[PDB]
Design an enzyme around this catalytic site. Structure first.
Site, PDB file in Angstrom:
ATOM      1  N   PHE C  87       0.795  -1.214   0.000  1.00  6.72           N
ATOM      2  CA  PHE C  87       0.000   0.000   0.000  1.00  6.72           C
ATOM      3  C   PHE C  87       0.830   1.269   0.000  1.00  6.72           C
ATOM      4  CE2 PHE C  87       0.154  -1.611   4.381  1.00  6.72           C
ATOM      5  CZ  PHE C  87       0.683  -0.550   5.060  1.00  6.72           C
TER       6      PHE C  87
ATOM      7  N   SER E   6      -7.267   4.089   2.939  1.00  7.34           N
ATOM      8  CA  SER E   6      -8.057   2.897   2.642  1.00  7.34           C
ATOM      9  C   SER E   6      -7.096   1.905   2.007  1.00  7.34           C
ATOM     10  CB  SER E   6      -9.206   3.195   1.706  1.00  7.34           C
ATOM     11  OG  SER E   6      -9.835   1.993   1.317  1.00  7.34           O
ATOM     12  N   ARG E   7      -6.560   0.987   2.804  1.00  8.72           N
ATOM     13  CA  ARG E   7      -5.486   0.138   2.316  1.00  8.72           C
ATOM     14  C   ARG E   7      -5.971  -1.201   1.816  1.00  8.72           C
ATOM     15  NH1 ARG E   7      -1.711   4.200   1.987  1.00  8.72           N
ATOM     16  NH2 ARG E   7      -1.313   5.082   4.066  1.00  8.72           N
ATOM     17  N   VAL E   8      -7.245  -1.498   1.986  1.00  7.21           N
ATOM     18  CA  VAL E   8      -7.796  -2.743   1.482  1.00  7.21           C
ATOM     19  C   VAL E   8      -8.312  -2.569   0.065  1.00  7.21           C
ATOM     20  CG1 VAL E   8      -9.877  -4.123   1.800  1.00  7.21           C
ATOM     21  CG2 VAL E   8      -8.225  -3.952   3.600  1.00  7.21           C
ATOM     22  N   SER E  10      -7.132  -0.335  -1.863  1.00  6.82           N
ATOM     23  CA  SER E  10      -6.035   0.139  -2.695  1.00  6.82           C
ATOM     24  C   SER E  10      -5.576  -0.933  -3.668  1.00  6.82           C
ATOM     25  CB  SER E  10      -4.866   0.590  -1.827  1.00  6.82           C
ATOM     26  OG  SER E  10      -5.303   1.447  -0.794  1.00  6.82           O
TER      27      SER E  10
END
Lengths: 177, 105, 156, 277, 140, 140, 52, 52, 140, 52
Positions: C87, E6-8, E10
């Site tokens: 990420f 929002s890393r999910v 992404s």
């Protein structure tokens, strides 16, 4: 011979190579000077720009047609295109003229340049007009000056300056025209 | 405040008008209901208000609405305790306010 | 607040402790540089409100050195993770222990006072500070090199 | 506990009042000491119209003056001048020459005796204690021609505007040593002037460069004083907005701890009463 | 934009939008380093005016009115026009008009290409950059 | 030091430490008195700058390691060597190093007679000031 | 009343610390100013010599 | 706070109060020097914040 | 003064005080906003130094000893003598003979008229202004 | 802290607009003409938008 040309353009390269590059180049008093000496102009006929200066005030910056200045060799008038001169001034009355009307400031010393483009520059430390001086004080001050003469010749240099300034001021206050 | 809402609700629901209702210090309504629920033995919520603060305010503020026959508009004087807008009584009251008129000295 | 600075992992250096931070278990060369880094970070924390209400303009020049060194060694605690590369995109950096001890001696003594603060941010080693410091100075000079136009590709 | 943040709020609030007072004190001091700056700006230009501007001369003994301030809430001014001082002092030192470094203002002596202590002979303070006058600059210039250098570099902040303060370097050449020689091209550039003084030109130029050093030193400390007040007026503005943002954050923290205190004391009372009821 | 993550999702981004959103939030990231000290804080250096007047245009690019949601292929074209420098000459006051002029004036085939391919293919950036120079952005 | 009190004060400590510790307790009060006036750098009249190093040398004298307690005679020699002279020409960085020079290189027979007397007699004060000048302090 | 109206600005500031009357700050100032007049000899024949 | 300056007894001169501090009780000459000490101490307490 | 309210307000005060105290609370508010400048050495623009000395003599006007209340006609006259500009603008060595000197040296007939009419009439502020100028304070 | 003379002409035009804007927000009420004499105004929304 001018093979080592110092200047604002020629300080910039040695600065940009030696000094750090974060800084802008430092300014110079030449950057804030709009009128100069060698580059001609500024006369356009019978007028010439007179800049009469003191450290505390700017007494005139207009254009005139004649100014008479109390040089060390006596008074001398500066017309529209005088010869370029650096005239040391003695205590006396600087008189401006723009035409028929004149203003007369009594000065204490200083110099007076006129430059090859005709601009003149009167540079004195204290110039009080003749209305601001009372004559009852200059007589008593000259009496107190031309009396005590100490043998320490620093003080007699100050005494000579005193009697010169006060005597020229006393002759400057009966010289109304 | 519910008595005043009833007299306004007659003019709304029966007369079919545009009614104003001036609840002078909605904070004192909140404070009185806090006192009532403290007297009934209920456990206070956050800083000391009633647990039913949101629903006791919403019982008043939800009868002030525009229906098909009329409307009730409401100019409510708001007191803010300890100069604290995040105090739960003005934080709850501001959730129902649709405007704000600040009178300055 | 460390995470609000952007420094990840957001480990508080003056709130994290260990019973292994002791010279009789990790050796005095590791213990002294750890206690020096903690001393510099606390001595920067003591200036934190003076820097707020007055600015850095008035601090002593033996304390502006302290503030710059602590702004360096609190960017040098930042590190990219191998699990955070999905990420962020920056690859992960495993740093050996001796690399950290030597890299934190260097910022303490003053061997890297000329490198900028952001050269230390999100790098593995003190070596990678040096390849990021000069890469920050290519890219301020690569702004003025070329005018890239793409011709004769409409028939390719 | 909940009393320390209250008195801390009081401390930050009074610091904000203090800096808002100091901001308009510096505003009044900049507004009155601006006309004196524009009046003294006239006399410096007949000399640079006569003698010119020669910063990059090769000298063997040179006096460099950093005109700093006395009080220390200037906000990035005296540090800027001690940057520019050595930035031009290393630029013009490549000849194996002598340098005397002088500071006007004791915040220059707090910053220059650690960066060039080998070359620092003079520290002049209390110059702005009432006002700067030409006799004061004359005495300082006489202390500068106590040494006999070949040049004079003067570092000061020119009061360009109330926000911009351009740091300048002004250069004065010694008469017999470099002033006649940096005018030599196809003869001389000063020979167009007809000297109407008592003695020879080696004394007219001596008097003129002593006058020119005194005039640019008067204007140096006067321009620097106006820019010191005008930068203190902005630094105290930043201090009020910083101590207002800090007060606005610390009041929210106080309100949170206030609400938390009332809730936890009431939960303690209810828990003590439910054990008995 | 700093605190929001929002890393999910992404990993589950629209490609093409993922290509330009990297330099979008990096340019906004170094724009947040120019926050409250452009000439508010102490001074100005004025070499980072490019990132200042670029982060402003990226900020007013991302403003959007209510009840009008934009399709994703018209969002990535708008932020491609923002972040490749195709709106660099426009003043800050009318980027709202500039990006809707970009959407209305660029021909609607490229939106179908971008939605069906799902990425800015190497065949598509050329026609996109050819379409983006031939539009009249207001002001200036 | 300002917040840690003790009710007995004197009459329940070492007499030799009682001679040399009141001039440490009050001098650290002078050192803390100037710490809120060290953010500007005015450095008044070589007083608020002299104790700013003297107390800073005393607080470095009071540091010690872990699991290594010191006998009382070595402590009242090591704080004799600090609130008297013998250490003002030493940098604040290396007084923790200078104290082992004071403790080890000084003859270990002054420690026995300081332990057995209990106070610093003027017979012992002379030899203690004598042997506090012969040792090598590493500060450079 | 003396320190208020200003009779004792000629005494140093720490002369007032831990004293009794106003007659003791005046003589604590005398002891302080004989003691800051002293400590000026430093050569020899002090306690540090051995055959003393 | 008084005791952290080493001043003993650590009596707060402002926060202490008595019923006898009345010019009809202890005399107006005592009362005015007491109120003057409290006046100068409150003025210094208000000046410390701008001194720092 | 700034935190003390009365929601009844001016509707229930002395009508001779109401026309004098309306100036008093206004210039006390002006003095309260300019309250940091009292502790300064650099004097400001003398629209603030004027309100500084005025508000200082007004706060010293409202001081009062215990168990000695004042009739309302005397407070009105003493506040009139400080809001209309009959102040001690001398050096303030004469605080001892000038606060009470106003109410003790004007003739008590103005108190009878001000009490019975309840208002400073144009026929009475004339005599009160004539009486306020001839106040002796012969201690100087 | 500086003065209206050093202001820009557009930084005096906003002052000259804002003073008459905040004067034009005032209104005499119908419920105050009992004791203030000036009759009260009921302004429509269409007059308000155009007049501002």
């Amino acid at each position: 011979e001018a093979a080592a040309p110092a200047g604002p353009k020629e300080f910039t390269e040695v600065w940009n190579k030696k000094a750090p590059s974060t800084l802008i180049v430092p300014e110079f008093p030449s950057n804030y000077t709009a009128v100069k000496a060698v580059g001609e102009g500024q006369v356009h006929g019978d007028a010439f720009p007179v800049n009469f200066y003191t450290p505390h005030s700017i007494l005139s910056q207009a254009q005139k047609d004649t100014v008479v200045l109390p040089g060390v060799d006596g008074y001398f008038g500066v017309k529209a295109s005088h010869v370029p001169t650096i005239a040391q001034l003695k205590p006396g009355v600087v008189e401006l003229h723009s035409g028929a009307e004149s203003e007369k400031f009594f000065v204490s010393g200083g110099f007076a340049f006129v430059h090859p483009n005709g601009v003149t520059d009167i540079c004195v430390l204290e110039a009080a007009t003749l209305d601001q001086v009372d004559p009852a004080a200059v007589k008593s001050a000259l009496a107190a000056a031309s009396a005590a003469q100490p043998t320490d010749e620093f003080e007699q240099a100050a005494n000579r300056a005193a009697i010169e300034l006060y005597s020229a001021l006393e002759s400057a206050v009966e010289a109304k025209a | 405040a519910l008595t005043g809402l009833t007299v306004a609700e007659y003019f709304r629901d029966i007369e079919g008008q545009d009614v104003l209702l001036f609840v002078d210090n909605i904070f004192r309504f909140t404070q009185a209901n806090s006192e009532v629920s403290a007297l009934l033995g209920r456990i206070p919520s956050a800083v000391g208000y009633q647990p039913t603060l949101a629903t006791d305010l919403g019982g008043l503020q939800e009868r002030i609405t525009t229906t098909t026959k009329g409307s009730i508009t409401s100019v409510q004087a708001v007191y803010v305790p300890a100069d604290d807008l995040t105090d739960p009584a003005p934080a709850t009251t501001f959730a129902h306010l649709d405007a704000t008129t600040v009178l300055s000295r | 607040s460390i995470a609000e600075l952007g420094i990840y992992p957001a480990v508080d250096p003056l709130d994290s402790t260990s019973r292994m931070l002791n010279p009789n278990v990790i050796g005095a060369e590791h213990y002294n540089v750890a206690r020096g880094v903690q001393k510099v970070l606390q001595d920067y924390k003591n200036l934190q409100d003076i820097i707020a209400i007055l600015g850095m303009d008035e601090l002593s020049e033996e304390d502006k050195l302290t503030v710059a060194r602590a702004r360096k060694i609190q960017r040098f605690l930042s590190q990219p993770f191998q699990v955070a590369e999905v990420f962020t995109g920056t690859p992960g950096k495993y740093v050996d222990l001796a690399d950290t001890i030597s890299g934190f001696q260097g910022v303490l003594t003053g061997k890297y006072d000329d490198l900028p603060e952001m050269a230390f941010y999100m790098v593995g080693d003190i070596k990678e500070v040096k390849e990021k410091a000069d890469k920050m100075a290519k890219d301020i000079a690569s702004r003025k090199e070329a005018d890239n136009k793409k011709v004769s590709e409409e028939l390719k | 506990s909940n009393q320390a943040v209250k008195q801390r709020i009081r401390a930050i609030k009074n610091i904000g009042k203090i800096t808002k007072a100091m901001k308009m004190v510096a505003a009044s001091k900049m507004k009155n000491a601006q006309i004196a700056v524009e009046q003294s700006r006239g006399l410096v230009d007949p000399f640079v119209r006569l003698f010119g501007d020669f910063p990059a001369v090769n000298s063997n003994k040179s006096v460099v003056v950093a005109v700093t301030s006395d009080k220390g809430l200037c906000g990035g001014l005296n540090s800027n001048i001690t940057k520019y001082t050595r930035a031009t002092l290393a630029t013009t030192e490549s000849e194996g020459k002598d340098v005397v470094v002088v500071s006007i203002g004791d915040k220059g002596r707090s910053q220059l005796t650690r960066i060039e202590s080998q070359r620092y002979q003079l520290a002049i303070a209390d110059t702005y204690k009432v006002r700067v006058t030409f006799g004061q600059a004359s005495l300082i210039v006489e202390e500068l021609i106590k040494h006999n250098p070949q040049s004079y570099q003067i570092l000061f902040n020119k009061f360009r505007s109330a926000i911009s303060f351009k740091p300048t370097v002004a250069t004065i050449l010694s008469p017999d040593l470099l002033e006649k020689q940096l005018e030599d091209v196809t003869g001389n550039s000063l020979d167009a002037y007809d000297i109407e003084a008592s003695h020879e030109r080696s004394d007219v130029l001596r008097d003129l460069t002593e006058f020119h050093l005194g005039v640019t030193l008067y204007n140096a400390m006067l321009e620097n004083n106006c820019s010191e007040h005008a930068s203190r007026m902005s630094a105290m503005e930043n201090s009020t907005k910083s101590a207002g943002e800090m007060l606005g954050k610390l009041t929210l923290d106080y309100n949170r701890k206030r609400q938390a205190t009332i809730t936890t004391e009431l939960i303690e009372i209810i828990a003590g009463a439910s054990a008995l009821m | 934009v700093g605190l929001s993550v929002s890393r999910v999702g992404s990993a589950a981004q629209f490609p093409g939008m993922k290509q330009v959103a990297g330099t979008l939030k990096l340019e906004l990231a170094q724009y947040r380093e120019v926050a409250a000290f452009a000439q508010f804080g102490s001074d100005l250096d004025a070499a980072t005016q490019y990132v200042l007047e670029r982060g402003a245009r990226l900020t007013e690019m991302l403003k959007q009115k209510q009840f009008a949601p934009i399709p994703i292929e018209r969002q990535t074209v708008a932020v491609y026009a923002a972040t490749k420098g195709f709106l660099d000459k426009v003043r800050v006051q009318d980027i709202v008009a500039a990006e809707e002029a970009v959407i209305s004036q660029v021909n609607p085939a490229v939106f179908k290409i971008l939605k069906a391919n799902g990425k800015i293919t190497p065949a598509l950036d050329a026609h996109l950059k050819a379409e983006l120079r031939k539009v009249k952005l207001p002001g200036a």
